[PDB]
């Protein structure tokens, strides 16, 4: 985050709305429901992750079909797009639907 934004804790991974600055965060070891909460699901975000955390996102529900992109640190919104996925495709994770936070 920029100046004044509460930082992600070291073991925490967040997605931050590009429009509002509001966030959805999980500790390392947790994942979302089948989809992210309705207020953020499929909305434009960037990752803001603490030093020990890695955010796994999917553009689909339920972290599925190896459509998984990995994000660390404080990610520029444009770097959510065209990202290498586990399944060998390059996907758009700017509007994610599901999320897991793991140790980096």
């Amino acid at each position: 985050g920029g100046g004044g934004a509460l930082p992600a804790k070291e073991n925490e991974g967040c997605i931050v709305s590009v429009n509002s600055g509001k966030r959805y965060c999980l500790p390392v070891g947790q994942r979302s429901g089948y989809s992210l909460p309705d207020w953020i699901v499929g909305q434009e975000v960037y990752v803001d992750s603490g030093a020990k955390a890695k955010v796994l996102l999917s553009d689909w529900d339920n972290l599925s079909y190896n459509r998984i992109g990995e994000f660390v640190g404080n990610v520029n919104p444009a770097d959510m797009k065209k990202v290498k996925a586990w399944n060998g495709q390059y996907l758009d994770f700017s509007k994610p639907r599901s999320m897991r936070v793991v140790y980096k």
């Binding site: 689909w60 529900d61 339920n62 972290l63 599925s64 079909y65 190896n66």
Partner: peptide, 8 residues
């Protein structure tokens, strides 16, 4: 192997 989604 991979997580899946609900069917139609």
């Amino acid at each position: 192997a991979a997580s899946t989604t609900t069917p139609a």
